[model samples]
Target: TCVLRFAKLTENALEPVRGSAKAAGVDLRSAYDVVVPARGKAIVKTDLQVQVPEGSYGRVAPRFIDVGAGVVDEDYRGNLGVVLFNHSDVDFEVKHGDRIAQFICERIFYPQLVMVDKL
Candidate 1:
């Protein structure tokens, strides 16, 4: 079995939680409150470091927050940060402990590449 390891970098950081057994992704929360202006973007810190299992890649996708998705490679060892984009006309406020994105770990393939002149 594969496990997604999460380490809190700060006291207030939250671990990613799955909504249900059938859920494909885990919720990623914010470690601090931030305000994103309309038509602007902001980077919200998660204050957590994730150990994405080897042979797989991690993706930070939007969870009804409208923020775009981010790819988390296996080599990333720093604290997790979420970039939130506010597309609405009003400013968006992200509170501490609020779910900002969803994290999905998917299996990756490593196949040998062959150089050929014709398909």
Candidate 2:
């Protein structure tokens, strides 16, 4: 079985949850109130850190709401931040515990680099 660990850096931070038993990704929640300006973008901090399995990276996908695809490197041990874009004319507010994005851990392959005399 595969496992993912989460650490809450703040009291408002929430652990990622799966929407269903067969869900492909886990839902990541917001830890603070953030406003995405109209026709602009904002970064909402989750105040949470994740431990993705080795040889794999974390990928963030959009939910019902708007969000930009993101990547979390396998070695990245930093806070989880979601970049939200507001295309509407009015500002968009992201509140605590709101699902910001869906996170999926995907396997990555490393290609060997070799010096070649010519192509």
Candidate 3:
């Protein structure tokens, strides 16, 4: 998940996922409702659900990972998702037409893989 920062957020903002997201079944603007000035790093939830193909992971427990924005797959054809967390002490008020955040599409060739390597 990508953590975005809004210098002066006044309202909620909608960010569009990159093009590669489409192959991974990710909608350009699938995930929404990213409150500005998030409270201590909020985790943006994605509208698309991904299931790692069987046999991909060894005989381990079912690992359910929350896919955020920026780290979407190249072939992922789903909605773009983002996570916004407010690190300030003030209650960030988001308006309807405020420029809360900016969405930028990025590509990752060798994305970091975080998984349970051992039991």
Candidate 4:
């Protein structure tokens, strides 16, 4: 299993992910230092473009996003973004260098795999 890590820099420095750059309509580097609105959250893309190895799956806790719990097949190597949900009444800070989230890659096995084709 592969482990991911990060750090927080400011009192409210929400580091932007590389994948979320286009989604946020901002270029790389500019994505950093993004401050989420009070009672609101932002989805930041991850810098690591990972392709989940064969016979493996990715699972995220605290299901907040549609893809929060699913399998990242071996053929996918796109940006891995995390949804930051602000559940607090007051504004929560996500400053630069702050350890916003981490990724834990694990292996899995599935029998009788199904392969479907779309017409």
The Cα local distance difference test for each model comes to 0.85, 0.83, 0.35, 0.45
Assess candidate 1 and give its lDDT. 0.85
**TM-scores for candidates 1 onward, in order:** 0.82, 0.82, 0.30, 0.49
Q: Is candidate 3 or candidate 4 better by lDDT?
A: 4
Tens-digit lDDT track for model 3 on 2-115?
432212121233333333643322222323444554345544433333322322211111111222325433344443234454666654543333232234333325778788
Query: What would the per-residue lDDT of candidate 2 be over residues 1-119, giving only the tens digit for each residue?
Result: 47777899989899888978998889989899898899889989889888887667889887524677778876788888877778889988888889888898898578998999999
Runs of candidate 4 exceeding 4 Å displacement: 1-31, 61-71, 110-119
lDDT of 1 at 85: 78
Root mean square deviation (Cα) for candidate 3: 13.6
Instruction: Give lDDT: candidate 1, residue 108.
Output: 67
lDDT of 1 by residue, 1-119 (tens): 47789999989899888867898899889999899989889999899898888778898887624676678777888888877778888998899999887898988678998999998
Candidate 2 or 1, higher lDDT: 1
RMSD of each: 4.0, 5.3, 13.6, 11.8
Question: How well is each residue in 12-111 modelled by candidate 4, as lDDT tens digits?
Answer: 3334343342332111221244455566777655444455445565543222212232335556665555566665566655444444443445665568
